[PDB]
Amino acid sequence: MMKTVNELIKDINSLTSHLHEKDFLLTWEQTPDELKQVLDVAAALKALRAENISTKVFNSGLGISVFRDRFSYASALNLLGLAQQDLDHGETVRETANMISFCADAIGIRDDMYLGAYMREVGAALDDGYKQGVLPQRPALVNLQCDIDHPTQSMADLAWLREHFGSLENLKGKKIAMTWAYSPSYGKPLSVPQGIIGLMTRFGMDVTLAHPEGYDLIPDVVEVAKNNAKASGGSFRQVTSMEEAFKDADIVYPKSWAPYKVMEERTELLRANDHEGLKALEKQCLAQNAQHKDWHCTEEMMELTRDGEALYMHCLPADISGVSCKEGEVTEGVFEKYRIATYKEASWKPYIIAAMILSRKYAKPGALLEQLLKEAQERVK
């Protein structure tokens, strides 16, 4: 609706934001108004797109993809009119940042390395190239996933929660279980669960985190979650069993990850081409994980949630038992029931990424949307 978008624009224009002066790396480094800006902008873009109104903001320009280690970033670039180009390294990051940015209005970085920086160096390098007149524009920087957070996934998940439940206010008092789940694939990043507990705790939700012993998340993020919950009127709890977390839950998000000590050692020999050390590491982790195969989102597990009908969430693809693999994170039956939910959840990501790009490029994204809405250029003829 023109009405829906007009209301979104009034909401956006009323917000105080400085996203135009910084990079959206971690959700917990953004204020509540800034988070709300990205969500509302994403909502306006999705609604415009739904009614065949073009949201093309760039007539030319590149969005670069940099991978330190699938469709959302490319979709977001294309939505705004940018063309994607992939990059086919920590020590040289600064020179590479400038080299790829002459005609780039966005750079998206997916980073798998755990060592206890990279994207902050990229941002400082972009600032330098722009301030010294090397770059005609300062590219927007998109965190497509780092060792600490996965803001693009977490924000899209929150945008979906807000659609599903009707508002952000309606999320207060809702119980969400962020749990581990078994995967045949070792070495999944801790970015997602950290991103979830880091963000959800800011909206007064009752967040329960559950995982087997040894799979602890980074201590600094746990402490952010606890402090977020205090200030937003929510709660944060850590438990040792999946059932514990699932009981009376409104929302379950059962997804595998590797211990961060594993990711560290994987990273070290990944850097050293130690292929044999790898297969040795992989072989062990697969054995550590196999004793927790019972962390499996089954019909029996869902029965314990509120009304036995919690909203099931997971980022796509999921490891579906008997489909994708022999034993995975969720059964065929539970996935079939919630398939449309998980699709709608994923559908928000391109809009969230596009909103992040716009929020860096325009101090007042609400002005830009009103312009797009008034021109009402068709997307398809």
Place this chain on the structure above:
Amino acid sequence: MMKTVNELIKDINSLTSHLHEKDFLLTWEQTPDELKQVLDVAAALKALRAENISTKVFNSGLGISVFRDRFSYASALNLLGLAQQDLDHGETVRETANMISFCADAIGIRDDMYLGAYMREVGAALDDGYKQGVLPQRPALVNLQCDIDHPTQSMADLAWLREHFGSLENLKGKKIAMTWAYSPSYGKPLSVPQGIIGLMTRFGMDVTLAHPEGYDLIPDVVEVAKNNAKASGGSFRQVTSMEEAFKDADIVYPKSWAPYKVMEERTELLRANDHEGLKALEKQCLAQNAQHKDWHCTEEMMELTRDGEALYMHCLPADISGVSCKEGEVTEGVFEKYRIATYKEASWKPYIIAAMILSRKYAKPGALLEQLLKEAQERVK
């Protein structure tokens, strides 16, 4: 010409089609009007493009490429204004279809697997995502090649025949020899010859299929060909020698393929990572094929065709003896003579693919072309 295109549009508007409600997987599942629609739309797009008129229909949107196993699909997407994105699996096809389609207006699938489905599951999954409101558009589905048919190649070949010979009516009574030819490369799909005999038999042509013993096409397609010929006033004949087929031919199409029993076993160990079984299979096939090296389109062979001047057809690239390889499907001399013909033949493919996309998206593609023609936006400034 504006006149040429105006006549094409009147032709298109007079046709009865339901391509907007189904996927163009097999040419023989389409009616004669529906085939004619794709051909006429492709012709209008080619003519518009030739006189520097933009045929951009999308201001943003993705076309996804999915490969189960080169330039035409990307060219077609770009012609209409879509950006190509490739996918870098049968069991998970449904979830993948939705995951890649949020911002896609087209999906192109090239499928090499022989097992006796995939694209029909994709289509049903797209229908589901659209009907449940996951996908804001139902993407057009393009068969870039399957185990059964290669409609994109066969239709472009027919569009060329129609240009070369002047009309579809002029194709009645023309003899076309679809023959095997020797290739150093084992494991070429049976899609092309099946596609050719499945389509050409619908236009009253005299279709002769020839191949060594053991290289039989799928029985179901042979029967479609025979039944097509009956109803269109054409003929279909199977012969055991290349000369037999070439004699008095108006058109020759001499191209290698592997027996379907070979493709089956290749597929099985391809799925099982049996690299050793592969090199063993390859080694044998190369020996089976080498006894038919004589299936070679030479100057001597062309002399037997009508006037010794049949139109030579082949999809690009061809295995050219002494150029691409030691011994192949056609000699350097015959290819040099027909090179421009084979280039023009290939030039139709992007237009055919684009016409298929448009034919799914618009019930009346003739309306859309008239709009494009009236706006007459330049392609190049």
Place this chain on the structure above:
Amino acid sequence: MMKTVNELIKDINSLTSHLHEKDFLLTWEQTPDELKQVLDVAAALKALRAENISTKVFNSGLGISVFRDRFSYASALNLLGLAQQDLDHGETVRETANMISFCADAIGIRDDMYLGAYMREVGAALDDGYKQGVLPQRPALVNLQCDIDHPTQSMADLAWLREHFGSLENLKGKKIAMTWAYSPSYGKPLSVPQGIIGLMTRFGMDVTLAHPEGYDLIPDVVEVAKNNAKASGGSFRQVTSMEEAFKDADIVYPKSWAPYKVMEERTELLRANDHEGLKALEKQCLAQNAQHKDWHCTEEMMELTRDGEALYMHCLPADISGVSCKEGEVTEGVFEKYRIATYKEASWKPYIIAAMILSRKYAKPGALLEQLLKEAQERVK
């Protein structure tokens, strides 16, 4: 400025050029007016882009990348509105050229092979396809690097020299040292130093070439350099030491390359899949190069140049000692000092490549720029 661009257009319109009738393969096959056209067009595009004016000339169309063996070509295509598509062979070049060009307005070729042709065959094949009506447009051909020249790099380097020093006239009498420098990576092409001495000698500069014994450039290019210098009032000198070349230099360009006899043998076994011969060749070259590790652009070396403040040039990436590698072409400290210079130098490449494409497509690129300037369509909304 509108004024700056208006003056550039008057400059361009006053030039005599036939670049619209040939391919820009080697800078020394172009006249001085033709070189100046590319430079001035590149300058106009850069200035337009800087003030948010769209230089989109194509509403659809492909630019193909062909690699015989990173961001500039894609950036240039996108600047003009073309979409990049990569090609994933000498004997079949002619057929491939047509096959990829139906919807291409540009083809970019990077060629690493040394054997004593390829791009000239591509150009003749494009001419044929266009003249016989196969191709609706004759694609522009861009040399992204060959065994002989790297015009795209050399022209961007000259465009930067002209910006840095203020004019082409201001380059007369300037001393530029094109020297070898040590790299841990064997097998760098001789294209760059040949391109530099082949071009710079045409503007009355005092060009000094320096390298260890055995690293001689192709004799034919050396002779072009010597003859260029004579006719432009410059000089060309060959020396045996880096210090010799660096002394009193205004500009230093210290970059590694392999002897051309090495590149020949690398090419031969590259064609023959001789992996073992390769590692054997690599192992030897690394030992030949290691005795010249002293060819290192250090702070001490820079002190010998004019005022100890020569402009340092290098194409990106550089091998930076202690950063990219243990020992390389330039120290961390010298690179930090000149980093912005090398970035600005690289920033010209997309504009140079785009100017080459425009210079082939329009006999009078000045007309096209005036049109772009008058429309003043925004790049970003």
